[PDB]
Design a protein around this ligand. Structure first.
Ligand code: COA
Ligand code: COA
Lengths: 152, 152
């Protein structure tokens, strides 16, 4: 029960595949565990300045993970970080794991001169909504999906 | 009134600064026109595979612009495109400009193997909401902002 948090680098594709499994198990979409990208693709993601993979380790086991994207802005020299997925092992809930990964993300943001971190949640994901409401400021917005298949 | 649409490259920082002015004027935030990043920063954005700047030209004038981010996914070898800003000159509305830039974005998505394009709107931006409702599928969601200043 000694938890370590870190940002994965491209030497850690093995721990990254294990974070992928955590997502699949926790979101029900094992979508995450078959059809995983090959090792070069994962390595290339971990090499980018614009993708942030964070993990919490129990021993060598991955018990929490967070994937976020850095969005370098165009109107001004500044950045925003967008949390895409965040999961914690079911056997490890209510132990501060999600909060520690978010805390590490803030340290990553500060190093990047990113001025805000933001994350989105569906109506009904009450854990998610409770966590983010404790940690940040809620706004409500609309999302639209567009199919590129219809290009003309 | 011959409109041309294209994706800017790093040789076109001049047209990109003009797209920045269109945003500032159209969103009221001229935030967009002072404090612009320097030319290397803009050039580096235009060099990335992960940032998409699209513009519509009347002569040499920029009359529409769209900034989007490609999000290479981690669970699977695939991508999503996230439209950040989209603006059209006030003297050029109701002429198909926004729709053409979105159409070009779909061609960019198809070339990238991106499978979806998505965009967000505030309750009350009825042009935006009407455009996106004609073009895609609305969902409603929550957004939370987190201040990295509080890292511990
Ligand atoms: C939400 C989740 C990240 C929680 O992780 P966690 O380590 O157990 O959270 P932490 O221990 O650091 O922080 C707990 C805080 O989150 C909130 N919360 C967490 N789980 C909750 C739950 N099951 N029910 C209600 N509120 C919850 C609370 O606000 C809580 O604060 P508190 O203990 O002071 O009341 C995750 O375990 C989960 O259950 N599902 C993943 C879904 C998700 O987060 N986002 C959508 C997937 S991308
Ligand atoms: C919204 C905006 C992109 C419209 O651009 P446009 O070139 O005039 O749009 P197009 O001519 O290609 O397409 C028109 C469609 O958009 C919708 N629409 C566009 N402007 C509208 C308006 N002012 N009022 C109501 N609906 C509008 C309609 O659905 C319309 O379809 P229709 O002509 O068949 O009824 C832009 O000009 C604007 O007014 N404000 C920018 C705000 C924004 O788009 N997003 C938030 C900023 S990031």
């Amino acid at each position: 029960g000694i938890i370590r948090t870190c940002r994965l680098g491209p030497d850690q594709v093995k721990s990254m595949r294990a974070a992928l499994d955590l997502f699949g198990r926790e979101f029900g979409g094992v979508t995450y565990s078959q059809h995983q990208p090959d090792s070069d693709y994962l390595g290339n993601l971990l090499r980018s300045k614009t993708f942030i993979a964070l993990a919490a380790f129990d021993q060598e086991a991955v018990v929490g993970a967070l994937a976020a994207y850095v969005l370098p802005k165009f109107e001004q020299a500044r950045s925003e970080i967008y949390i895409y997925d965040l999961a914690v092992s079911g056997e490890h809930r209510r132990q501060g794991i999600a909060t520690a990964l978010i805390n590490l993300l803030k340290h990553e943001a500060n190093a990047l001169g990113a001025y805000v971190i933001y994350v989105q949640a569906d109506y009904g994901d009450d854990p998610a909504v409770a966590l983010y409401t404790k940690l940040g400021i809620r706004e409500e917005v609309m999302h639209f999906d567009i199919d590129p298949s219809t290009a003309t």
